[PDB]
Amino acid sequence: QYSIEKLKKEENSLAKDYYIYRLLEKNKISKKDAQDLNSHIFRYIGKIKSELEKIIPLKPYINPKYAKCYTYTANTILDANLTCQSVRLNSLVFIASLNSKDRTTLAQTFKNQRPDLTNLLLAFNTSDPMSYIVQKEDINGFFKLYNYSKKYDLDLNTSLVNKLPNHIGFKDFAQNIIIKKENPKFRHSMLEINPENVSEDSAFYLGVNALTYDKTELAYDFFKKAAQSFKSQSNKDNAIFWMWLIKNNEEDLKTLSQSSSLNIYSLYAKELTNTPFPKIESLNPSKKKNNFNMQDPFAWQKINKQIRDANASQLDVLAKEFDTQETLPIYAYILERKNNFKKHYFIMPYYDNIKDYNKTRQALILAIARQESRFIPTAISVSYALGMMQFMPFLANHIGEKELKIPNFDQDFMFKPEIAYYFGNYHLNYLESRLKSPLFVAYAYNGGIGFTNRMLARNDMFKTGKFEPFLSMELVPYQESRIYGKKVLANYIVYRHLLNDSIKISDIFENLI
Ligand SMILES: CC(=O)N[C@H]1[C@H](OCC2=Nc3cccc[n+]3C(=O)C2)O[C@H](CO)[C@@H](O)[C@@H]1O
């Protein structure tokens, strides 16, 4: 392994973070090594933060200007100057902590300048603050209360619900309560939001909301508004698909069958309309090799930043440089960006390691690897998932040390295609044998089998129903996994096709119920 001094000479990157983390967790960083260190951390969040602050806990940070203001409590707040008073009253917990006499006083003080404060102050002098804020139609206060406690739930009138989307907090709020199935009175009130007043994801989610109460008309209008406003074509297609499912206008399905975006919805539309399968590019570079060390994590991280920080002209220079068999995953990575994501790249690198698996298992492996890494051997994620199949270190060690007992096993073996594909196959077997559907497998690869089993046990998920299974696909409670499923499923269809082992996507959907 590389020492801390040798890491310090490399550019900040997720690779460097990973390796610093690995020293940390094996307790190989002294208090003296850890001094100048958070100048060397590319992204100072998560576990590397936790770990480095067990050595050097951070004193900061409260602004030197308001330092005075954090020396008062709910007992001494009326002794605070007027700035200090207003600063501390940013916290709804602080306000809750005050007694009701002090709230009445402070509320008189602020009714002129800060009636936002006044309203919250007076709100916490009632048994139900939300109800007070709702009656005042204080939008800022509504969201402060929502962030403070998710437990307030109350019917909102048309006037008020239509003001809510104007606030930055609305999107997360709506997605939260609709996916989690919380705040039933909020959700029911959101049926009266005018579609004119929302766009993009908010409008999409309000469409899902409307379906759950069997309000198909409002749902369509919500989905329509989502389709017209969405930035990405994939999302636009998701919304058009619903537009069609609800009303069945063939204009909508045709638009969807003709989409440039390859996704489960455009694939399904093409199947229903007898539209041919989309053009999949074919990359067979003659040249066999170049310099590039495909096993070097640091080399990838630098070439990666070059590919993001590159004008459409610098890309052509990289494309030609990496036009080899050895660097085929990079070639395709560059190409994908270069042609502005209009062409469809579905490579099959390191094929010898999977050619003996049945074709259906091959497709799943490839589908997962495409989404997880675009087949970059030394790919590292923000949570330090490793290699082409993006194994979390816990699971990689459990498999390699305990289950497959590989000799001299290190987790950096996940950077090896032969290992990635083999551990991938192993883990996929465990999941397929319990879940069957490759969609369900995909949810569990990403978010674990506990989460997936909890979801399938539910009465209202992946059961029979008017809009099933598409509705349940919209209600998978982890956003990361909800998206991952859709994408891996589309990769699966495509890879089964390229492997001369086609399946109708409608068959996939029937076996979800
Ligand atoms: C390298 C990386 O961060 N991969 C993550 C992957 O990132 C999606 C990627 N998507 C794309 C898309 C186009 C080009 C390149 N990439 C990537 O390199 C990675 O997202 C998954 C969840 O959906 C994560 O589990 C996975 O670790």
Side-chain angles (χ1 to χ4, degrees):
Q1 181 172 230
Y2 331 75
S3 67
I4 195 61
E5 287 79 38
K6 204 176 188 173
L7 284 189
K8 279 183 171 178
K9 296 227 290 277
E10 294 284 352
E11 297 167 51
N12 288 30
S13 60
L14 281 168
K16 175 151 164 182
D17 281 18
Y18 167 53
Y19 283 121
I20 291 167
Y21 180 70
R22 281 190 79 190
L23 298 172
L24 285 174
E25 77 181 324
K26 286 179 297 193
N27 319 303
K28 288 231 289 293
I29 296 283
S30 66
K31 202 170 186 171
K32 292 140 200 176
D33 292 323
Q35 303 288 20
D36 63 82
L37 201 65
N38 53 216
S39 83
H40 279 274
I41 285 179
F42 182 79
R43 171 171 180 291
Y44 187 75
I45 315 185
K47 297 147 292 186
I48 199 176
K49 173 190 193 61
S50 274
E51 278 290 289
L52 188 42
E53 284 169 8
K54 282 170 59 191
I55 302 186
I56 297 170
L58 46 53
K59 270 287 145 54
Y61 179 60
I62 288 172
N63 186 2
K65 177 184 177 172
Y66 306 131
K68 152 119 156 182
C69 299
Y70 294 102
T71 70
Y72 299 97
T73 78
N75 270 26
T76 66
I77 193 53
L78 292 188
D79 304 335
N81 75 57
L82 192 73
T83 292
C84 285
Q85 297 190 359
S86 77
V87 170
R88 297 307 294 293
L89 290 178
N90 272 313
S91 158
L92 272 62
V93 166
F94 190 74
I95 294 184
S97 82
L98 303 169
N99 80 105
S100 73
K101 310 270 65 178
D102 295 350
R103 279 192 297 254
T104 291
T105 291
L106 285 168
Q108 268 163 242
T109 301
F110 283 106
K111 173 158 190 185
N112 297 343
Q113 197 88 324
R114 298 290 306 293
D116 49 296
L117 297 191
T118 287
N119 283 354
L120 289 172
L121 289 168
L122 291 194
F124 280 99
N125 275 6
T126 66
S127 68
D128 189 1
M130 183 57 91
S131 176
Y132 184 92
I133 289 292
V134 160
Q135 182 266 310
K136 304 299 280 170
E137 296 194 359
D138 186 343
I139 311 302
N140 281 345
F142 172 99
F143 281 96
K144 286 210 76 158
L145 275 190
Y146 179 71
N147 300 332
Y148 160 75
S149 162
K150 266 60 175 158
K151 297 298 178 184
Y152 297 123
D153 186 37
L154 170 63
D155 292 289
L156 308 173
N157 64 16
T158 302
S159 160
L160 178 83
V161 272
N162 280 287
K163 310 207 190 146
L164 291 179
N166 309 313
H167 187 292
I168 54 174
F170 180 73
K171 196 215 88 133
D172 282 0
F173 167 79
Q175 182 190 135
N176 224 239
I177 75 184
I178 295 169
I179 267 72
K180 301 289 176 204
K181 272 155 179 306
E182 286 170 352
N183 311 76
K185 298 192 173 182
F186 287 170
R187 288 204 323 266
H188 177 278
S189 300
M190 282 195 316
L191 291 189
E192 297 305 312
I193 306 194
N194 193 309
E196 298 176 12
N197 278 307
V198 285
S199 67
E200 299 211 73
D201 312 21
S202 297
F204 193 80
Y205 290 132
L206 291 158
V208 174
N209 194 42
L211 287 189
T212 64
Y213 291 97
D214 193 53
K215 298 281 190 184
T216 51
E217 279 299 305
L218 320 187
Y220 175 96
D221 299 357
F222 276 128
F223 284 127
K224 189 171 180 190
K225 181 59 199 276
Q228 292 163 352
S229 36
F230 265 140
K231 296 171 171 45
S232 99
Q233 183 61 48
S234 205
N235 284 339
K236 181 163 167 175
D237 286 357
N238 192 164
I240 293 157
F241 174 71
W242 276 109
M243 274 173 80
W244 173 71
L245 201 46
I246 298 168
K247 273 211 200 310
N248 290 110
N249 169 49
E250 289 183 358
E251 285 277 55
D252 287 322
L253 184 62
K254 168 181 161 169
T255 308
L256 184 58
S257 52
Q258 283 172 354
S259 168
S260 60
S261 167
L262 195 181
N263 62 70
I264 66 171
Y265 301 106
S266 72
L267 283 183
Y268 187 46
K270 288 181 154 68
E271 173 179 300
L272 288 182
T273 52
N274 188 48
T275 307
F277 211 86
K279 186 147 188 287
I280 309 301
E281 296 307 300
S282 180
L283 302 185
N284 190 19
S286 62
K287 200 76 238 311
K288 170 54 67 66
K289 41 155 183 163
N290 62 7
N291 290 305
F292 197 76
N293 177 10
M294 291 291 312
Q295 278 307 123
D296 188 357
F298 296 115
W300 165 239
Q301 286 301 311
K302 67 176 144 66
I303 216 69
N304 193 18
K305 60 157 282 182
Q306 285 176 52
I307 291 163
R308 301 169 180 296
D309 295 313
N311 54 70
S313 150
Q314 287 176 306
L315 285 185
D316 306 298
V317 197
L318 288 176
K320 290 178 192 172
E321 159 68 16
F322 283 95
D323 184 356
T324 66
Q325 295 273 302
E326 180 187 287
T327 65
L328 168 63
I330 300 176
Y331 184 55
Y333 184 101
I334 295 151
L335 280 198
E336 193 175 352
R337 301 196 74 264
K338 201 196 81 170
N339 306 316
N340 279 311
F341 308 82
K342 292 171 178 174
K343 308 195 167 190
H344 305 315
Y345 295 104
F346 290 75
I347 60 171
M348 300 180 246
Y350 313 110
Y351 187 58
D352 287 352
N353 297 302
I354 61 165
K355 68 181 168 69
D356 292 339
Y357 295 132
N358 72 78
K359 295 211 162 186
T360 286
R361 177 52 60 84
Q362 289 179 38
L364 188 46
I365 292 168
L366 286 171
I368 297 279
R370 194 176 173 279
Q371 171 60 12
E372 284 298 1
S373 84
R374 291 291 194 275
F375 298 111
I376 302 285
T378 66
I380 308 155
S381 92
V382 293
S383 56
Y384 312 133
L386 299 176
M388 290 193 318
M389 296 296 297
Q390 289 283 298
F391 271 83
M392 284 305 294
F394 185 69
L395 185 62
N397 285 321
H398 176 104
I399 292 186
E401 276 165 17
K402 182 163 178 185
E403 298 301 281
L404 294 188
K405 333 223 211 320
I406 306 214
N408 309 134
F409 181 70
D410 188 60
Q411 59 183 49
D412 289 4
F413 278 11
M414 305 316 310
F415 296 155
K416 293 176 158 174
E418 319 85 52
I419 300 284
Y421 275 162
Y422 181 54
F423 279 44
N425 182 55
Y426 177 104
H427 189 56
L428 285 169
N429 251 136
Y430 167 64
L431 294 172
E432 209 183 76
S433 90
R434 294 193 158 53
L435 294 168
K436 288 283 195 167
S437 178
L439 180 66
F440 290 163
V441 165
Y443 294 144
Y445 195 94
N446 173 260
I449 189 158
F451 144 65
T452 317
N453 287 321
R454 277 197 289 292
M455 167 173 68
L456 293 175
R458 279 175 53 199
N459 281 285
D460 54 350
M461 292 295 285
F462 290 102
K463 300 307 174 275
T464 85
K466 195 193 284 189
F467 290 117
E468 294 296 336
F470 310 104
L471 183 49
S472 303
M473 288 180 82
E474 298 305 349
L475 296 175
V476 171
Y478 292 12
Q479 184 192 49
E480 186 184 346
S481 284
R482 181 169 64 246
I483 291 172
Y484 182 85
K486 290 179 180 185
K487 276 173 150 87
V488 168
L489 182 54
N491 292 337
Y492 176 72
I493 301 309
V494 174
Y495 271 120
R496 282 201 67 176
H497 197 262
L498 293 176
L499 283 177
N500 289 310
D501 174 44
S502 272
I503 187 158
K504 289 141 51 55
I505 183 156
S506 62
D507 287 359
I508 299 313
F509 294 138
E510 285 152 17
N511 310 321
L512 291 183
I513 291 153

